[PDB]
């Protein structure tokens, strides 16, 4: 039933604003936390409990923390329109940033702020009765997101133990880039994702820019558009917990179906009816059309081409007016295709979900209103190509000890670079070995 | 002669809701539980499935089990949901995780004692107990693991009674779950030792029934579960109404099962026909027999044409002649003689019951024991060996606590079942 | 940017309450509430 959201740094707080905007509008909570209880047609229902708790006077408050080292972005949240929705203790801010240094976040500065965060998370977890995971939003390119993300994840593993932690992570794009030191921070985040995370979904802004240019008709997109797309994806995946459907799917079923071996937990995400209002009334949007859409690389939210690899498992979430027979016919047609290949040890490649609640329309939004949508998360060996380009850029800079002074002076052994780079190299070799056909049988 | 029902998991609870709607409709029980029927014939066998509560009311002898109460709240919320006794809903606090080992070992052992206590309380209240009836899927998590756990406990406590299961099995073309081969193999291993009679249905076969025969534009799970509830309520009809040649679950088992491992059967129901066509052809025994043996009307993906019938049974409902039944079963056996196993001189048992389902003049349900069932097991075993050789998802099951030896035992036992079917396929008189 | 993007639609939502979509989530019923009310009341079990 309940889930707790952890938002870290700048990207995580900005994506949080769009997410909580959407979850308010989907449940029907007003921006001040109230509800017009007297003007109602249906009947009042418990579905909010996954994301909200009531005080008893009928105000709603959300199950989230916002973590940042600079004050300005959290103060922007504090002074905006949703000021009264959040409890002020939940909005935690430090004094000074981690200055794009993973070492600064992890060793020196995040250690001061981390105990307040852990006390708040404990206070949330005590007010729960069937917690079934943590959702974490962060970028691995910046200093506080990488370093404090890593420390918090390490502490959570010891404190909560077996409880699941699912991360949505903005990884450095393969040629769009924002800062010089991105490779070091992304590498040194390898251990946290590899050993302390159950599924990690990777996103690149260059793909969402391509999707918003090609499918939507937006010439000049900005981060609020990308964050609205991410919020829609999260709402689709969590709808299975919150609304009626033909085939429900609990968050533990994703973990059971998608991860064959404990390191192979990085998944690609895509969303089908990204369409503008003027195009949407010219076209039907049947089940088979959106199912065909989710497999084209123009639909993906990560810059990778799955044609360079093999699928291991796919999980397809359908929401809206869909009939199971059409889903089965569509999946059988996909299975027929020659450019889609599965590893021979995974014969039953698909998991399906079908939910009755159609996707919500946001007043300022740019997506059209549509009766049905499908969302896919899938595990594929093509992801190995994404790590190799980061490793090449890391190998380039570390050779000349280009910026090592900052990290070693701020507290890190030089050995840690070689350690992290060898561990990610071993992860690449794992993805090479697992994907090799067992052609030798006798 | 009263049956106790157990419904497990989402599929089981959904099928159960439609079954108890059909049963309450035929006996004239209002959705409040009040008897509103119009003949004593309805009342005189009501005991078989209902217990009598005070001033009119009847309550259905069924146990509902699930690991999260969400489904239980959905079934309680349905149109007939009120009839069920509140104390009969048993639920835990965490899910099966779509994992057989969780359903069998961790949450199974946590809940099973309260289920065994309720099942014993219900069984020992009967004046004479007939078999148990269980509905579940083998591909799921709590259905497979806890259903087979409960079956084993009930077989320990009531070894002289009958154990009957209706079971849903994965389609050959599209999977609904990635880990289906493990759950199916382990469940079939448990069933072949424990069960007395097992019926199998493919959702793909119900889709092909709806599209080809009924030409439905927009089918839903309510239609598939209505077809299943119709056949389920048809099998028991001779237990609970008069007829010229009464029949019973034990008599079906004795005539259908030649050897104790060969107890997996195909199902069909005959007077299926589209609303546009129905004006063009009246019901008669030749029409029911022709549809009844047409593989188009069979609820599994395996086709009889690739195998041979060891035994079959037909249960007829309606006011009808013995000539049409006896001479039709002889004529069908004579014209298609290559499809019947030759060392049994007559493979078909018949039974006739006076009272048809409402709004049909006549109906028949068909139960068939056919060697083509070996193809399903062979397909599941191949997919299992591909997954097991590569340790594809095994850490979940081993982390719950299972020994790897269980997988090799279950594979070997299922492979021997396939071999035994193949051996009986190619037997000869010599 | 946050003003013109999010606060504008927040103000529009404040002015108009007919934009909230209807839904049906009948899976939240009495047994779920019974499990909710009974946290920490485990009694009479054998180990």
């Amino acid at each position: 039933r309940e889930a707790i959201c952890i938002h870290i740094g700048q990207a995580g707080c900005q994506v949080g604003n769009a997410c909580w905007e959407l979850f308010c509008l989907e449940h029907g909570i007003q921006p001040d936390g109230a509800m017009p209880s007297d003007k109602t047609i249906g009947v009042e229902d418990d579905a909010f409990n996954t994301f909200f708790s009531e005080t008893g006077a009928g105000k709603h408050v959300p199950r989230a923390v916002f973590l940042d080292l600079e004050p300005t972005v959290v103060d922007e949240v504090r002074t905006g329109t949703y000021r009264q929705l959040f409890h002020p203790e939940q909005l935690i801010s430090g004094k000074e940033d981690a200055a794009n240094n993973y070492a600064r976040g992890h060793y020196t500065i995040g250690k001061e702020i981390v105990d307040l965060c852990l006390d708040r998370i404990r206070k949330l977890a005590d007010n729960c009765t069937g917690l079934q995971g943590f959702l974490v939003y962060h970028a691995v390119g910046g200093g506080t997101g990488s370093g404090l993300g890593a420390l918090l994840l390490e502490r959570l593993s010891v404190d909560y133990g077996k409880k699941s932690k699912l991360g949505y992570t903005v990884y450095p794009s393969p040629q769009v880039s924002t800062a010089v030191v991105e490779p070091y921070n992304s590498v040194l985040s390898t251990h946290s994702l590899l050993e302390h995370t159950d599924v990690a979904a990777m996103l690149d802004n260059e793909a969402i820019y391509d999707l918003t240019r090609r499918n939507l008709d937006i010439e000049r997109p900005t981060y609020t558009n990308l964050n609205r797309l991410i919020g829609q994806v999260v709402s689709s995946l969590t709808a299975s917990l919150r609304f009626d459907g033909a085939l429900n799917v609990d968050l533990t079923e994703f973990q059971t179906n998608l991860v064959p071996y404990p390191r192979i937990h990085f998944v690609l995400t895509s969303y089908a009816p990204v369409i503008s209002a003027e195009k949407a009334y010219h076209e039907q949007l049947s089940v088979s059309e959106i199912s065909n859409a989710v497999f084209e690389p123009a639909s993906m939210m990560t810059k990778c081409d799955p044609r360079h690899g093999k699928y291991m498992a796919c999980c397809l979430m359908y929401r809206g007016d869909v009939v199971p027979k059409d889903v089965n016919a569509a999946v059988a047609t996909i299975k027929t295709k020659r450019t889609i290949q599965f590893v021979d040890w995974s014969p039953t490649g698909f998991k399906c979900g079908i939910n009755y609640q159609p996707p919500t329309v946001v007043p300022g939004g740019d997506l059209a209103k549509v009766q049905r949508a499908v969302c896919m998360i899938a595990n594929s060996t093509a992801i190995a190509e994404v790590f190799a380009r980061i490793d090449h850029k890391f190998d380039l800079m570390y050779s000349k000890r280009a910026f090592v002074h900052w990290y070693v002076g701020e507290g890190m052994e030089e050995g840690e670079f070689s350690e992290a780079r060898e561990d990610l190299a071993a992860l690449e070799k794992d993805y090479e070995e697992v994907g090799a056909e067992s052609a030798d049988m006798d | 002669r009263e049956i106790v029902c157990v419904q497990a998991g989402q599929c089981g609870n959904q099928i159960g809701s439609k079954f108890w709607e059909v049963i309450s409709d035929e006996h004239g029980v209002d959705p409040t539980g009040t008897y509103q029927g119009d003949s004593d014939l309805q009342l005189e066998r009501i005991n078989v499935y209902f217990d009598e509560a005070t001033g009119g009311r009847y309550v259905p002898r069924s146990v509902l089990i699930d690991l999260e109460p969400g489904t239980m709240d959905s079934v309680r919320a349905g149109p007939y949901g009120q009839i069920f006794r509140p104390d009969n809903f048993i639920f835990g606090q965490s899910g099966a995780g779509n994992n057989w080992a969780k359903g069998h070992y961790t949450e199974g052992a946590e809940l099973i004692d309260s289920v065994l206590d309720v099942c014993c309380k219900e069984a020992e209240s009967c004046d004479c107990l007939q078999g148990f009836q269980i509905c579940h899927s083998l591909g799921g998590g709590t259905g497979s693991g806890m259903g087979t756990l409960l079956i084993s406990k009930l077989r320990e406590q009531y070894p002289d009674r009958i154990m009957m299961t209706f079971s849903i099995i994965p389609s050959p073309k599209v999977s609904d779950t990635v880990v289906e081969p493990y759950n199916t193999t382990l469940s079939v291993h448990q069933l072949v030792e424990n069960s007395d009679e097992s019926m199998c249905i493919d959702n793909e076969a119900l889709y092909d029934i709806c599209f080809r025969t009924l030409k439905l534009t927009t089918p839903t799970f309510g239609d598939l579960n209505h077809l299943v509830s119709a056949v389920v309520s048809g099998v028991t009809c001779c237990l609970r109404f008069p007829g010229q040649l009464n029949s019973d679950l034990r008599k079906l088992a004795v005539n259908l099962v030649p050897f104790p491992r060969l107890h997996f059967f195909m199902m069909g129901f005959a007077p299926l026909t589209s609303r546009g066509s129905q004006q063009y052809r009246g019901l008669s025994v030749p029409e029911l027999t022709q549809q009844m043996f047409d593989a188009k009307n069979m609820m599994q993906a395996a086709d009889p044409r690739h195998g041979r019938y060891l035994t079959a049974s037909a249960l007829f409902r309606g006011r009808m002649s013995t000539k049409e039944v006896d001479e039709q079963m002889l004529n069908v056996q004579n014209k298609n003689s290559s499809y019947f196993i030759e060392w049994i001189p007559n493979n078909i048992k018949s039974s006739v019951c006076d009272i048809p389902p409402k709004g049909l003049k006549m109906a028949v349900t068909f139960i068939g024991n056919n060697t083509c069932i070996q193809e399903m097991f062979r397909r599941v075993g191949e997919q299992f060996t591909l997954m097991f050789r590569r340790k594809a998802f095994l850490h979940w099951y081993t982390g719950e606590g299972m020994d790897e030896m269980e997988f090799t035992e279950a594979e070997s036992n299922m492979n021997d079942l396939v071999s035994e079917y193949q051996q009986y396929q190619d037997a000869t008189i010599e | 940017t946050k003003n013109v993007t999010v606060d504008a639609t927040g103000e529009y939502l404040k002015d108009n309450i007919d934009e909230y979509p209807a839904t049906s989530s009948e899976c939240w019923g009495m047994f779920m509430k019974f499990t909710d009310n009974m946290k920490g009341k485990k009694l009479r079990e054998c180990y």
Partner: peptide, 23 residues
Amino acid sequence: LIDPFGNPKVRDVPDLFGRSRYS
């Protein structure tokens, strides 16, 4: 809305598209 046996039936899937919770 027709049953597989030809009889009429009530709705079984909620109608939600185009609906609003608050009047």
